[PDB]
Design an enzyme around this catalytic site. Structure first.
Site, PDB file in Angstrom:
ATOM      1  N   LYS B   4      52.898  45.914  30.448  1.00 23.83           N
ATOM      2  CA  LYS B   4      51.766  45.007  30.289  1.00 23.83           C
ATOM      3  C   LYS B   4      50.791  45.151  31.438  1.00 23.83           C
ATOM      4  N   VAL B   5      49.510  45.139  31.092  1.00 23.29           N
ATOM      5  CA  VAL B   5      48.442  45.203  32.085  1.00 23.29           C
ATOM      6  C   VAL B   5      47.902  43.788  32.359  1.00 23.29           C
ATOM      7  N   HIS B 121      60.746  27.042  52.201  1.00 22.94           N
ATOM      8  CA  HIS B 121      60.405  27.519  50.869  1.00 22.94           C
ATOM      9  C   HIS B 121      61.201  28.793  50.509  1.00 22.94           C
ATOM     10  N   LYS B 193      51.709  38.957  53.407  1.00 20.04           N
ATOM     11  CA  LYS B 193      50.515  38.734  54.217  1.00 20.04           C
ATOM     12  C   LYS B 193      49.320  39.440  53.622  1.00 20.04           C
ATOM     13  N   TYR B 196      47.750  37.701  50.687  1.00 16.92           N
ATOM     14  CA  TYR B 196      47.061  36.429  50.967  1.00 16.92           C
ATOM     15  C   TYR B 196      45.796  36.580  51.804  1.00 16.92           C
ATOM     16  N   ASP B 200      43.032  34.899  49.767  1.00 22.47           N
ATOM     17  CA  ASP B 200      42.438  33.717  50.357  1.00 22.47           C
ATOM     18  C   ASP B 200      41.005  33.955  50.758  1.00 22.47           C
ATOM     19  N   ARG B 214      44.849  51.437  53.852  1.00 23.87           N
ATOM     20  CA  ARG B 214      44.881  52.367  54.954  1.00 23.87           C
ATOM     21  C   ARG B 214      46.238  52.326  55.650  1.00 23.87           C
ATOM     22  N   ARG B 233      51.286  55.202  62.098  1.00 21.90           N
ATOM     23  CA  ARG B 233      50.689  56.248  62.894  1.00 21.90           C
ATOM     24  C   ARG B 233      50.181  55.693  64.214  1.00 21.90           C
ATOM     25  N   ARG B 253      40.103  29.193  61.023  1.00 26.64           N
ATOM     26  CA  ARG B 253      39.004  28.800  60.159  1.00 26.64           C
ATOM     27  C   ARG B 253      39.412  27.998  58.937  1.00 26.64           C
TER      28      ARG B 253
HETATM   29  N1  LIG Z   1      34.399  29.463  60.184  1.00 27.53           N
HETATM   30  C1  LIG Z   1      34.080  29.264  58.905  1.00 27.53           C
HETATM   31  N2  LIG Z   1      33.694  30.269  58.108  1.00 27.53           N
HETATM   32  C2  LIG Z   1      33.370  30.069  56.809  1.00 27.53           C
HETATM   33  N3  LIG Z   1      33.421  28.869  56.210  1.00 27.53           N
HETATM   34  C3  LIG Z   1      33.821  27.781  56.937  1.00 27.53           C
HETATM   35  C4  LIG Z   1      34.180  27.913  58.342  1.00 27.53           C
HETATM   36  N4  LIG Z   1      34.522  26.688  58.788  1.00 27.53           N
HETATM   37  C5  LIG Z   1      34.372  25.841  57.754  1.00 27.53           C
HETATM   38  N5  LIG Z   1      33.958  26.502  56.699  1.00 27.53           N
HETATM   39  C6  LIG Z   1      33.675  25.992  55.398  1.00 27.53           C
HETATM   40  C7  LIG Z   1      34.502  24.792  54.971  1.00 27.53           C
HETATM   41  C8  LIG Z   1      33.373  24.006  54.329  1.00 27.53           C
HETATM   42  O1  LIG Z   1      33.124  24.472  53.004  1.00 27.53           O
HETATM   43  C9  LIG Z   1      32.110  24.355  55.087  1.00 27.53           C
HETATM   44  C10 LIG Z   1      31.842  23.358  56.235  1.00 27.53           C
HETATM   45  O2  LIG Z   1      32.956  23.264  57.147  1.00 27.53           O
HETATM   46  P1  LIG Z   1      32.657  22.857  58.684  1.00 27.53           P
HETATM   47  O3  LIG Z   1      31.312  23.461  59.018  1.00 27.53           O
HETATM   48  O4  LIG Z   1      33.969  22.926  59.449  1.00 27.53           O
HETATM   49  O5  LIG Z   1      32.412  21.315  58.367  1.00 27.53           O
HETATM   50  P2  LIG Z   1      33.114  20.008  58.963  1.00 27.53           P
HETATM   51  O6  LIG Z   1      32.721  18.974  57.927  1.00 27.53           O
HETATM   52  O7  LIG Z   1      34.568  20.173  59.404  1.00 27.53           O
HETATM   53  O8  LIG Z   1      32.150  20.114  60.288  1.00 27.53           O
HETATM   54  P3  LIG Z   1      31.439  18.815  60.928  1.00 27.53           P
HETATM   55  O9  LIG Z   1      32.293  18.744  62.186  1.00 27.53           O
HETATM   56  O10 LIG Z   1      30.000  19.179  61.140  1.00 27.53           O
HETATM   57  O11 LIG Z   1      31.506  17.636  59.949  1.00 27.53           O
HETATM   58  O12 LIG Z   1      32.297  25.707  55.517  1.00 27.53           O
HETATM   59  N1  LIG Z   2      40.203  51.925  61.403  1.00 24.30           N
HETATM   60  C1  LIG Z   2      39.626  52.610  60.400  1.00 24.30           C
HETATM   61  N2  LIG Z   2      39.347  51.992  59.264  1.00 24.30           N
HETATM   62  C2  LIG Z   2      38.793  52.569  58.178  1.00 24.30           C
HETATM   63  N3  LIG Z   2      38.471  53.855  58.140  1.00 24.30           N
HETATM   64  C3  LIG Z   2      38.685  54.618  59.237  1.00 24.30           C
HETATM   65  C4  LIG Z   2      39.272  54.037  60.460  1.00 24.30           C
HETATM   66  N4  LIG Z   2      39.363  55.038  61.352  1.00 24.30           N
HETATM   67  C5  LIG Z   2      38.892  56.159  60.736  1.00 24.30           C
HETATM   68  N5  LIG Z   2      38.478  55.893  59.495  1.00 24.30           N
HETATM   69  C6  LIG Z   2      37.884  56.766  58.473  1.00 24.30           C
HETATM   70  C7  LIG Z   2      37.017  57.946  58.906  1.00 24.30           C
HETATM   71  C8  LIG Z   2      37.491  58.999  57.934  1.00 24.30           C
HETATM   72  O1  LIG Z   2      36.694  58.895  56.741  1.00 24.30           O
HETATM   73  C9  LIG Z   2      38.914  58.646  57.568  1.00 24.30           C
HETATM   74  C10 LIG Z   2      39.990  59.319  58.423  1.00 24.30           C
HETATM   75  O2  LIG Z   2      39.898  58.886  59.787  1.00 24.30           O
HETATM   76  P1  LIG Z   2      41.028  59.224  60.875  1.00 24.30           P
HETATM   77  O3  LIG Z   2      42.375  58.833  60.295  1.00 24.30           O
HETATM   78  O4  LIG Z   2      40.432  58.638  62.139  1.00 24.30           O
HETATM   79  O5  LIG Z   2      40.994  60.825  60.795  1.00 24.30           O
HETATM   80  P2  LIG Z   2      41.272  61.980  61.889  1.00 24.30           P
HETATM   81  O6  LIG Z   2      41.324  63.218  61.020  1.00 24.30           O
HETATM   82  O7  LIG Z   2      40.330  61.871  63.028  1.00 24.30           O
HETATM   83  O8  LIG Z   2      42.765  61.650  62.442  1.00 24.30           O
HETATM   84  P3  LIG Z   2      43.922  62.706  62.894  1.00 24.30           P
HETATM   85  O9  LIG Z   2      43.511  64.173  62.817  1.00 24.30           O
HETATM   86  O10 LIG Z   2      44.228  62.206  64.302  1.00 24.30           O
HETATM   87  O11 LIG Z   2      44.927  62.377  61.842  1.00 24.30           O
HETATM   88  O12 LIG Z   2      38.994  57.236  57.747  1.00 24.30           O
HETATM   89  N1  LIG Z   3      37.343  43.687  28.753  1.00 23.83           N
HETATM   90  C1  LIG Z   3      38.105  43.309  29.796  1.00 23.83           C
HETATM   91  N2  LIG Z   3      37.760  43.586  31.077  1.00 23.83           N
HETATM   92  C2  LIG Z   3      38.535  43.215  32.116  1.00 23.83           C
HETATM   93  N3  LIG Z   3      39.712  42.554  31.936  1.00 23.83           N
HETATM   94  C3  LIG Z   3      40.154  42.233  30.681  1.00 23.83           C
HETATM   95  C4  LIG Z   3      39.359  42.610  29.531  1.00 23.83           C
HETATM   96  N4  LIG Z   3      39.991  42.182  28.469  1.00 23.83           N
HETATM   97  C5  LIG Z   3      41.143  41.598  28.882  1.00 23.83           C
HETATM   98  N5  LIG Z   3      41.203  41.618  30.192  1.00 23.83           N
HETATM   99  C6  LIG Z   3      42.263  41.128  31.053  1.00 23.83           C
HETATM  100  C7  LIG Z   3      43.017  39.914  30.611  1.00 23.83           C
HETATM  101  C8  LIG Z   3      44.411  40.312  31.041  1.00 23.83           C
HETATM  102  O1  LIG Z   3      44.714  39.884  32.364  1.00 23.83           O
HETATM  103  C9  LIG Z   3      44.483  41.824  31.039  1.00 23.83           C
HETATM  104  C10 LIG Z   3      45.140  42.393  29.766  1.00 23.83           C
HETATM  105  O2  LIG Z   3      44.397  41.878  28.652  1.00 23.83           O
HETATM  106  P1  LIG Z   3      44.301  42.695  27.294  1.00 23.83           P
HETATM  107  O3  LIG Z   3      44.342  44.157  27.700  1.00 23.83           O
HETATM  108  O4  LIG Z   3      43.289  42.112  26.348  1.00 23.83           O
HETATM  109  O5  LIG Z   3      45.805  42.341  26.803  1.00 23.83           O
HETATM  110  P2  LIG Z   3      46.447  41.847  25.424  1.00 23.83           P
HETATM  111  O6  LIG Z   3      47.885  41.561  25.733  1.00 23.83           O
HETATM  112  O7  LIG Z   3      45.606  40.834  24.705  1.00 23.83           O
HETATM  113  O8  LIG Z   3      46.303  43.201  24.555  1.00 23.83           O
HETATM  114  P3  LIG Z   3      47.397  43.970  23.649  1.00 23.83           P
HETATM  115  O9  LIG Z   3      46.835  43.890  22.229  1.00 23.83           O
HETATM  116  O10 LIG Z   3      47.370  45.381  24.199  1.00 23.83           O
HETATM  117  O11 LIG Z   3      48.675  43.232  23.910  1.00 23.83           O
HETATM  118  O12 LIG Z   3      43.140  42.236  31.109  1.00 23.83           O
HETATM  119 MG   LIG Z   4      49.776  42.093  25.303  1.00 25.23          MG
HETATM  120 NA    NA Z   5      55.755  44.742  28.625  1.00 22.02          NA
HETATM  121 NA    NA Z   6      54.487  35.947  55.455  1.00 22.61          NA
END
Ligand SMILES: Nc1ncnc2c1ncn2[C@H]1C[C@H](O)[C@@H](COP(=O)(O)OP(=O)(O)OP(=O)(O)O)O1
Ligand SMILES: Nc1ncnc2c1ncn2[C@H]1C[C@H](O)[C@@H](COP(=O)(O)OP(=O)(O)OP(=O)(O)O)O1
Ligand SMILES: Nc1ncnc2c1ncn2[C@H]1C[C@H](O)[C@@H](COP(=O)(O)OP(=O)(O)OP(=O)(O)O)O1
Ligand SMILES: [Mg+2]
Ligand code: NA
Ligand code: NA
Ligand SMILES: Nc1ncnc2c1ncn2[C@H]1C[C@H](O)[C@@H](COP(=O)(O)OP(=O)(O)OP(=O)(O)O)O1
Ligand SMILES: [Mg+2]
Ligand code: NA
Lengths: 481, 480, 481, 481
Positions: B4-5, B121, B193, B196, B200, B214, B233, B253
């Site tokens: 199943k997908v 949990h 982790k 989430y 999240d 990566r 690595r 946050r």
């Molecule tokens: N660092 C963050 N990055 C993105 N969103 C955040 C961050 N902190 C809080 N939020 C979200 C949660 C809420 O939807 C909204 C406002 O939260 P925040 O600015 O902490 O308000 P608050 O009501 O706790 O502050 P105040 O102390 O001004 O009342 O943004």
């Molecule tokens: N932290 C990172 N996050 C995401 N992409 C990265 C990061 N570091 C490097 N890249 C990119 C750049 C390249 O497109 C690809 C490979 O990078 P990297 O693993 O640094 O290759 P490299 O060939 O220099 O390593 P080595 O020869 O030491 O294995 O990923």
């Molecule tokens: N067109 C779409 N684009 C992206 N996601 C979709 C689309 N249609 C369904 N999904 C989602 C919902 C489900 O999480 C997952 C599988 O749904 P779908 O492939 O329609 O299964 P199904 O069980 O109804 O078909 P089957 O007849 O193969 O059993 O994809």
């Molecule tokens: Mg199905």
């Molecule tokens: Na199945």
């Molecule tokens: Na954990």
């Protein structure tokens, strides 16, 4: 006290005026945290756990964006801070009336449970808004921020449901007509409600949204059309509008009318029907309501959310055993089986009055196959789905006014041939899904034979899987060969 | 029967083996649709409506990705299709034990409600998994797909909770690395982790800095002290430090948001006041409380976020106390944030002293004119442990690495070998103070007590100290 | 004229004032389409094909966002439409001075090619801006939209480079001090230039950006600090600011100072040095300039872009053979081989004047192992990298002013212990990479022995792979065991 | 055997087999870093700075994904590691033949410059691939990793260009037919090349992509159709395929055929035509080639990239003055002015040979209105654009085979009636844009009059802005009123 910043995943940081905060911090509004936007869709798309609450904030925010942008480009419109607040409030509050599982409640449940009444979530929103206002002393707070409650409460309600019956609106005069085209656009369906749900549902469902609302806003102007001031789009943008409705249609076809999502909605509705007699919800003055009658009292409706599903599921009351059993079948994924899908051909249209007679028709078909089991009307569900661009058979783009770069105040019309030959010819169709309540392999096989026969008999389209599911039935129909 | 997908917004299209489908389509698993991932966070971050159900699919999927990738790079590990299924199952099922509002239940509610028990949990997941297996005839279905239920059920449980000299009985030393996938007790790097962080962030509206894909591409199994372990690595060490910084950001946050935490506190308080009057039917018709449903899995099945709405919608006058608190949440009459502080130097506040802190704040003697006098029960003191997952220890010291030039040779990397820009300490404490009295005069008074208490305990100057208590802050010379 | 709308992938739809359009539609600005934002990084991160042009639009747009938001929250600041335009112009134009391959030109090439001069891209921007203004008749167009060219051109230049020399600025008085903290913030490094590149580079590189600039803007206020009006952040947001610099550091460590990216920059620089004598660029009055001297004439500099790389690569002139060969080695990926990396310990700091002497030091190390080859100074490259939070050894957060919810006009300070014990203790460090020009297995082995020995000898950190690359050398150092 | 990891913004971390690394690290491939994916589009969409290089890696990667997924679901196909490598190589290498500014070169420039030849970038890719192989000693390296160069080089070339003329392919037999449906699908147009560009172009342009390729792969199976093994889609997925082509069409209408993007392409083409005589590119054995003839020698073609634009722009040679002037007009944004757009009606189809005669037709129209200026043929540009679903007038979905859940090995067909009434009736159309080389207000006014008259005269569609731009001309046509 002052402005709140809310972080929404779709819109980012949203400012909320302290008046909106007061409207939001009420049980009538907070209720919306417990109603899933897509009801049964969550049982198919596991990301689609979002609720009406967050959707409502987004609709409010967007309503404010559009009106504010119009105001800044065109100060001659005389849009006041008062006007902006009322449009924001209408945006927040147009989802107040949704019942449990959103569209299942007003689209499936109430029509079956209370056939004699005509109910829409929009009517619910008006009633719920009234209850929210009166129960929370909002009117003094409206006055504090420069609103005039009598005119303005009316304006808000009219934005949500339309004329409460020559200029038919009493919240604002003709010179502010465009303010009625923001939250719910009865003319063409282009409103901010759609814009938030395209973005929000896509983000949760894991589908990608092709419509850019921000671009629409930047190209939006108010122009005079037939002595009314209307929101117009730039002529160039016409393709994007056709795309916007194509997008709407995609969301419906892939997600909102998913064949399993719809069957889950049907099963939940069936459980609610069997539970309706035994669930009681306390309303105004201690009076008791059923799930199907809580729509008559807003105090009861407040306490009517998706929690009803779990109330039934967790119940021990033997009177709820029938309802509880259906919901347990959902948990085990013993769902009614999809049999197939078809469409009417040419101009054939299935009327709402004929829906009840369709399971009987399928069961009455006489397929020439050897069948160990014999199936009856009640074993079949026939789900008729109207797929359209929002305005029945009409093209909504014919109800959009446009303007050109060279004359920004001059509204014009654009016909379909003026845009593209690659656009749809028709703007409404019907899908017919058939399902079987009998879930074993032998019944499902039998059901498929009846179904494909019924298609042949009614001269409907060949089911796509027709040759696979009923190889002995499809050769009788020459049109399919 | 074939795959199943599922379309997940985070991972896209996920394939599910028919055995996983069978485990998923049970009330024990479906239960997780009704438990919010971030509990009270939804009341702060309106996007954070996601549930444990979808998180579980993601953990399962990722567990399968890691084990499968290890298998493809290193066939000498002899990872079987059987091994992959058990790792996927452990991934799916490690969230089974979560109660209503996820971490509030095991972190706030049960410790207050049932101090004599030690509950996590994870223990819940093991118990719930057992119940899921037995109640749904899963064992025959495991056999059908080549699992050996006795060994394998053990293996799954050990992956979720750890050991019930080589301490594991589900798999031998030669497969040690399989225990580092779903829940990594050694260093905290696991797939739970990874899902989430991504999930999240997508819902909260913050962006996630960690790239799990990566990590997988750079992961190898190597021998370290006669054990086969997942190694990273050497170059990737910076990304691992970044992974824990990311974890810390999410906590600061979102998970420990000052309002989110107060909402969790209020919901917990309502549950405590409701606990006597809510009844949940378990095995053989026996009745359980919210706090005792953890002792019977049949009851626990029916224990979800629905409890919140059960209380909120109730008419029973015995539930009035619990119902009133929840109504105060809806009206946003929340306990008011007073301020925040930290201990200085090595000072560490022990779990046993949490109860005595509201008393300490109320006992402070600020030298100012006060309209109201406040008592211990008017204050909440929330002590928050912020760490890199391993108390005071650096988790990177428990990671093994390999070099491009010798891929089978494990090595260690010390903190000075990486960067001077890294944290010196890996654990700290935050103390938030709130006031249950919500009027302007009480809040003013509360701030005076609080800032005085900070001065008295030699804690850090609250950031807003000069604004909230201008007559108190000058007494402390270290603050200016 | 009204606004042009530009669709940027990072910021979405951006409005451009007709004055900015005029500044943009000039060869001096359009030039920026041919300079890659990340120079050599594109040879490591294939997504990083973006140019300075699009970055400049983003800096302009963001500059406008910040100033406009400040204006709307605090009308008492008396920010005029004139002020907004000048800040947008400074934002657009602060990248005008970048040479081919952006930071490699002013960071690697010019210091080697012209040691006696002190050049920065910022000076280049000022000069280029002057040339853009004068060559395109911009001054009349500034007047048309209410700018006063004498004061305002000065204001723009001061925003890009700082005081052109008690209040040191002459474009605006003390009461508008905060306007100098938008495009380029000399005080703490929090400016809109950074914000666009975090977002833009991440989107192209395939790294994810954890900084939210929109949230910073919503929490930004102007407050009085020491008789100056400064941009302040909300106290709560202090964590996000530390995170902003951590993000900056991540981008540097992963992308901008990637060990291969840097070696490619080194090789391209070396090719430019060998080509510098033979490439000619026509400037003012037909006069000819070298790559290294085009910085002295803006007309020549206009025609100095990444095209220089391909000019060399495609050349037939035998005098360019040396330069051309190096670039061909880049195409074949015959790069100088990475030997290892180390850091100084304690307070040891390598000064810019000592960079030249480092390859000699490595070659002079005496490993005491059997070596098939003996290597010389010219076989080694030593790349010293300064990693900091933007203000040398200082903590930039100590130079940020804050405000509280309860007193929005009252600025305060926040010390590091007031935020978190998990923050960095030091805010500057050095990385030393060693590479070997000899690419065979035997030379690379030998190089690693010299390198690890040199680390031991200088009391630098143990290379991470030390025990693997030099197992016979690492046991001599007890500190490493 | 070490795989190299590349971080792509679209696909994330991609593994490259050491053989692909060897093919990539050659001047023939690296060349692609200097050719913009969307040519002139970058001058409209500032995000669209991406090059063919990164697109090629993505095509390679996706080709590998599809073939690998097919292999894992259906081991009975006997897909070898050898087969996977050849499909990856074909994917990498199908963009090798692109000239400067991608589709402008093969779509505009070569047809005008060399009318006698029939050239496609695909032929270029084959030739370039041959040159890459031979110039870099790739054949020994193919053998080392189990390829058989004679058969396999053929297989790769056939994947890029089709049959090198009953089974027409010689690289693989009928039992591997599906391998020819991956990189370039001549049957229905569903291939991985499209999938990468939808995702890549959207990410850079700032449009959002509604097609999900990963979902297509998960639902793809190989089945027998007419004694051939073909890639089949799940029957349910038919809607998504129609959506895929709608998406393709959206990208074309919004981005690839943007009216300004196309005029910039036209101007660059015109400059190349005027420069063609005086630019020389050194090829094999020191022989010299023009821009228009470098397609005949791969060594010259290697050095033919977007750098040609800057070579012309920066030139001092007075022979290049005409070409240089056009490019300077691009920098100043003195572009040919958009006059309007129209379409043919009914079955009218404008052939490629008639394009040249259209500016004459527009100038010959007799609007009969007060005109300050009289305009001639050379003052008008007429751009004819073919918008289709990839297969001329045919529906590509009629050339897709499907399977059902109940019989996964049984291929079936699906007709348009069986899917939706909301789909397009026609699958090809033409757009006609008119532009004026004269840029003043009076000429533009006149041009609009000629244009709208010409529309009326040819019985083409009413221009959208017709009533605004030519109010005295539109009333004569009754069909428009
Ligand atoms: N660092 C963050 N990055 C993105 N969103 C955040 C961050 N902190 C809080 N939020 C979200 C949660 C809420 O939807 C909204 C406002 O939260 P925040 O600015 O902490 O308000 P608050 O009501 O706790 O502050 P105040 O102390 O001004 O009342 O943004
Ligand atoms: N932290 C990172 N996050 C995401 N992409 C990265 C990061 N570091 C490097 N890249 C990119 C750049 C390249 O497109 C690809 C490979 O990078 P990297 O693993 O640094 O290759 P490299 O060939 O220099 O390593 P080595 O020869 O030491 O294995 O990923
Ligand atoms: N067109 C779409 N684009 C992206 N996601 C979709 C689309 N249609 C369904 N999904 C989602 C919902 C489900 O999480 C997952 C599988 O749904 P779908 O492939 O329609 O299964 P199904 O069980 O109804 O078909 P089957 O007849 O193969 O059993 O994809
Ligand atoms: Mg199905
Ligand atoms: Na199945
Ligand atoms: Na954990
Ligand atoms: N449909 C679209 N969706 C998203 N971005 C688009 C779309 N069409 C164009 N763009 C981009 C390209 C440009 O960067 C920006 C503005 O384009 P457009 O509005 O076509 O300007 P224009 O100058 O060609 O139109 P005009 O001058 O006719 O108003 O938007
Ligand atoms: Mg324009
Ligand atoms: Na610093």
């Amino acid at each position: 006290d002052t402005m709140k910043v809310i972080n929404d995943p779709i819109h980012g940081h949203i400012e909320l005026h302290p008046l909106l905060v007061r409207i939001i911090d009420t049980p009538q509004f907070q209720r919306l945290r417990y109603i899933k936007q897509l009801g049964g869709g969550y049982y198919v798309f596991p990301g689609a756990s979002h609720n009406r609450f967050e959707h409502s904030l987004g609709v409010g925010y967007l309503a404010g964006c559009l009106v504010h942008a119009l105001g800044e480009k065109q100060p001659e419109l005389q849009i006041s801070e008062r006007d902006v607040l009322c449009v924001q409030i209408a945006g927040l509050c147009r989802n107040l009336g949704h019942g449990p599982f959103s569209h299942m409640f007003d689209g499936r449940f109430i029509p079956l449970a209370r056939p004699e009444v005509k109910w829409t979530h929009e009517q619910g929103s008006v009633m719920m808004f009234e209850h929210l206002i009166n129960s929370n002393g909002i009117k003094p707070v409206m006055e504090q921020y420069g609103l005039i409650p009598e005119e303005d409460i009316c304006f808000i309600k009219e934005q949500i449901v339309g004329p409460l019956e020559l200029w038919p609106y009493k919240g604002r005069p003709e010179n502010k007509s465009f303010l009625y085209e923001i939250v719910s656009n009865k003319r063409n369906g282009i409103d901010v409600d759609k814009w938030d749900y395209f973005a929000r549902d896509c983000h949760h469902l894991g589908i990608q949204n092709n419509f850019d609302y921000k671009r629409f806003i930047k190209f939006a102007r108010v122009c005079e059309v037939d002595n009314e001031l209307r929101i117009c789009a730039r002529d160039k943008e016409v393709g994007n509008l056709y795309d916007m409705f194509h997008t709407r249609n995609s969301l419906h076809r892939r997600a909102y009318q998913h064949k399993v999502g719809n069957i889950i909605d049907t099963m939940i509705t069936d459980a609610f029907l069997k539970a309706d007699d035994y669930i009681e919800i306390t309303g105004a003055g201690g009076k008791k309501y059923r799930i199907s009658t809580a729509i008559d009292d807003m105090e009861a409706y407040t306490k009517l959310t998706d929690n009803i599903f779990l109330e039934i599921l967790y119940s021990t009351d033997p009177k709820l055993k029938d309802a509880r059993e259906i919901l347990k079948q959902i948990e085990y994924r013993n769902l009614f089986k999809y049999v197939g899908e078809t469409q009417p051909t040419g101009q054939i249209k299935i009327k709402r009055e004929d829906y009840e007679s369709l399971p009987k028709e399928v069961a009455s078909a006489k397929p020439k196959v050897l069948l160990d089991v014999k199936l009856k009307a009640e074993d079949f569900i026939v789900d008729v789905i109207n797929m359209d661009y929002g305005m029945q058979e009409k093209n909504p783009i014919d109800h959009v006014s446009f303007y050109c770069k060279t004359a920004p105040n001059r509204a014009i019309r654009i016909t379909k041939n003026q845009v593209s030959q690659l656009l749809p010819e028709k703007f409404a169709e019907q899908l017919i899904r058939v399902y079987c309540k009998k879930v074993d392999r032998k019944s499902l096989y039998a059901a498929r034979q009846y179904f494909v026969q019924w298609c042949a008999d009614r001269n409907f389209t060949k089911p796509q899987d027709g040759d696979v599911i009923a190889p002995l039935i499809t050769p009788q129909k020459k049109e399919w060969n």
